[PDB]
Design an enzyme around this catalytic site. Structure first.
Site, short mmCIF file in Angstrom:
data_model
loop_
_atom_site.label_atom_id
_atom_site.label_comp_id
_atom_site.label_asym_id
_atom_site.label_seq_id
_atom_site.Cartn_x
_atom_site.Cartn_y
_atom_site.Cartn_z
N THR A 1 0.88 -1.19 0.00
CA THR A 1 0.00 0.00 0.00
C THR A 1 0.91 1.23 0.00
O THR A 1 2.02 1.20 0.53
CB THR A 1 -0.93 -0.20 1.20
OG1 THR A 1 -1.81 -1.30 0.87
CG2 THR A 1 -1.74 1.02 1.66
N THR A 2 0.42 2.31 -0.58
CA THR A 2 1.00 3.61 -0.41
C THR A 2 -0.12 4.58 -0.13
O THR A 2 -0.93 4.80 -1.00
CB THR A 2 1.68 3.92 -1.73
OG1 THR A 2 2.76 3.00 -1.99
CG2 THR A 2 2.22 5.33 -1.74
#
Lengths: 228, 227
Positions: A1-2
Site C-alpha cells: 500500500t502507499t
C-alpha cells in the site's frame, strides 16, 4: 500500500494506490483505501484490510452518534482520538497504520498519523504503508509548504506513482480526495495515465548489456539479439 | 657420455642435450610458414601424406584454441596435441576467471612456460614439436613461436622444419608493413610449393588458416577455393 495526506491552506488532500495483495498475487486491483468517517473527515487505511475496515466502520458509527447529540459537525481531532484509542486498545491483535485527515471550521485542514502501536501525531503531511519508505526523500527534496489545492492534488498523484513504480506491493489506480470548506472532490487516475512509471521513463528504455555475444574482444557493445 | 640421457642434467659446457635432440625432431619434420600482416595472421603447413587412402582433414596440424587464436604444430604431431589442450585450458581460464579473450602475448607466454617444465624433471622428456601461435585479440595481430626449450619469440614472418632455410630466404623478400591476408595466402603457398622435395615425399597437401578482419577475427581454415 502507499497512502498519504497533505495539508494545504484551507484543507487536506488524501491519496492512495488501489492494490490489495496476498504478498505475491493481487486479489483486488481496485480497492478503495480512502474511507469516509464523516462528511469532511476521511481516513487512509494500510495494513490488514479486515482490521482497518472494522476500525473505520466503528469509528464512523461513533462520530455519527456524536454529531446527532451535539448537533454540530465534528472536528478532526475527535475522529483522530476515537480511532487512536481503538488502535491502542487492540495493538497486539491487529496490523493497522492509519491516517485521519479532514476539514473542520475551528482548526481548518488537519492530518494525524496513527501508526502501528497506536501513537497519534499531528503533522503537515503523513506517509504510510509499505510504499511510504520510498517517499520520505521525495518529500524532503520536492515538497513545499504553501501549495494550493491543485498543486497538492497533483503532487500527491505524482508521489503515489513514484512509490508504486518501485513497490511490488502497491499499484493500480491512484485515488485522491480533497476536503475543504466546499464540496468533497474525488479523483481516480488509471494506470494508463499515471504521471510516472519506469516503463515510460526514457532512462530505462535501453536494456542493460547482460548478454553480449561471444567475441574476440573484451569490448562490450550490445546484447546478442539473434543466434549465430 | 652419460650426460645425455635425462634432461635434468647439465653437460659440462652448460648445454641440455635432451632438449637439443628434441629440437632435432622438429628440424626433420615438415615445413610450415607464417606471416603477420596488417589485417591478421596467416599460417600454412605442408602435410606429408603417408597413404593415398586418407580422408581429407586427417592429421591436421592447425587447431583453434579460442575464437580468436590458433596453433600450428610442427614436429611430432601427438606431442603437439598435448600442447593444444593446455592452450585451450589457458584460453578458457582467461574467459572464465578474468572475462577477457586471452591476449596473444600471454597465451604464448603460458605455452612456453608449459613446454619449459618438461625440460627440468628427470621423469619427463621435452616435447618434440614447436608451436606457432597466431592470435588477433585486443592486442592486435600477433605471431609467436614456442619451441621444445620453452623459448618464446614474436615474429613478423617465420618458417620451421626441413625446408626452413630456403623458406626464410623467400619470406625475407616480402614487405610486412603493406602485405594483407589475401596476398599472403598466395605467397606463402608458393613458398611451400617451391621448397617441397619431390624425390622423398611424393604425397602431400597444404593446410592454411587465418585470423583476419575478413573472418570477423575468428581463427579458421581458409576456404578451400583459394589456393
Amino acid at each position: 500500500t502507499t497512502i498519504m495526506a497533505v495539508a494545504f491552506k484551507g484543507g487536506v488532500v488524501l491519496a492512495a494506490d488501489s492494490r490489495t495483495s496476498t504478498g505475491t498475487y493481487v486479489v483486488n486491483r481496485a480497492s478503495n483505501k480512502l474511507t469516509k468517517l464523516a462528511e469532511k473527515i476521511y481516513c487512509c487505511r494500510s495494513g490488514s484490510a479486515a482490521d482497518t475496515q472494522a476500525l473505520a466502520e466503528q469509528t464512523a458509527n461513533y462520530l455519527e452518534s456524536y454529531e446527532i447529540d451535539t448537533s454540530k459537525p465534528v472536528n478532526v481531532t475527535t475522529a483522530a482520538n476515537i480511532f487512536k484509542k481503538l488502535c491502542y486498545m487492540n495493538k497486539w491483535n491487529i496490523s493497522a497504520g492509519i491516517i485521519v485527515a479532514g476539514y473542520d471550521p475551528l482548526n481548518g485542514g488537519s492530518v494525524y498519523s496513527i501508526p502501528s502501536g497506536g501513537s497519534c501525531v499531528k503533522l503537515d503531511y503523513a506517509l504510510g504503508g509499505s510504499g511510504s519508505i520510498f517517499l520520505y526523500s521525495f518529500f524532503d527534496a520536492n515538497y513545499k509548504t504553501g501549495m494550493s489545492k491543485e498543486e497538492c492534488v497533483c503532487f500527491c498523484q505524482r508521489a503515489v506513482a513514484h512509490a508504486y513504480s518501485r513497490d511490488g506491493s502497491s499499484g493500480g489506480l491512484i485515488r485522491t480526495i480533497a476536503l475543504h470548506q466546499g464540496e468533497p472532490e474525488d479523483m481516480t487516475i488509471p494506470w494508463t495515465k499515471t504521471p510516472y512509471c519506469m516503463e515510460k521513463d526514457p532512462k530505462y528504455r535501453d536494456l542493460a548489456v547482460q548478454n553480449p555475444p561471444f567475441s574476440s574482444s573484451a569490448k562490450i557493445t550490445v546484447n546478442q539479439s539473434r543466434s549465430e | 657420455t652419460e650426460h645425455d640421457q635425462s634432461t635434468d642434467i647439465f653437460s659440462a659446457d652448460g648445454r641440455v642435450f635432451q632438449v637439443e635432440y628434441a629440437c632435432k625432431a622438429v628440424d626433420n619434420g615438415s615445413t610450415a610458414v607464417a606471416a603477420c600482416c596488417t589485417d591478421g595472421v596467416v599460417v600454412a603447413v605442408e602435410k606429408i601424406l603417408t597413404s593415398r587412402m586418407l580422408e581429407e582433414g586427417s592429421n591436421d596440424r592447425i587447431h583453434a584454441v579460442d575464437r580468436q587464436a590458433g596453433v600450428c604444430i610442427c614436429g611430432m604431431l601427438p606431442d603437439g596435441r598435448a600442447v593444444v589442450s593446455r592452450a585451450r585450458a589457458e584460453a578458457e581460464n582467461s574467459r572464465d576467471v578474468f572475462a577477457t579473450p586471452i591476449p596473444g602475448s600471454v597465451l604464448a607466454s603460458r605455452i612456453g612456460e608449459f613446454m619449459h617444465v618438461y625440460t627440468t624433471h628427470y621423469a619427463y622428456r621435452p616435447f618434440g614439436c614447436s608451436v606457432i601461435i597466431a592470435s588477433y585479440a585486443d592486442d592486435g595481430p600477433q605471431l609467436f613461436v614456442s619451441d621444445p626449450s620453452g623459448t618464446v619469440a614474436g615474429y613478423y614472418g617465420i618458417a620451421l622444419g626441413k625446408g626452413k632455410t630456403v623458406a626464410k630466404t623467400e619470406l625475407e623478400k616480402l614487405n610486412f608493413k603493406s602485405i594483407t591476408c589475401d596476398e599472403a595466402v598466395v605467397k606463402l603457398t608458393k613458398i611451400l610449393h617451391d621448397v617441397h622435395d619431390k624425390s622423398k615425399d611424393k604425397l602431400y597437401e597444404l593446410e592454411v588458416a587465418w585470423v583476419c578482419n575478413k573472418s570477423n577475427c575468428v581463427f579458421q581454415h581458409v576456404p578451400n577455393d583459394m589456393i
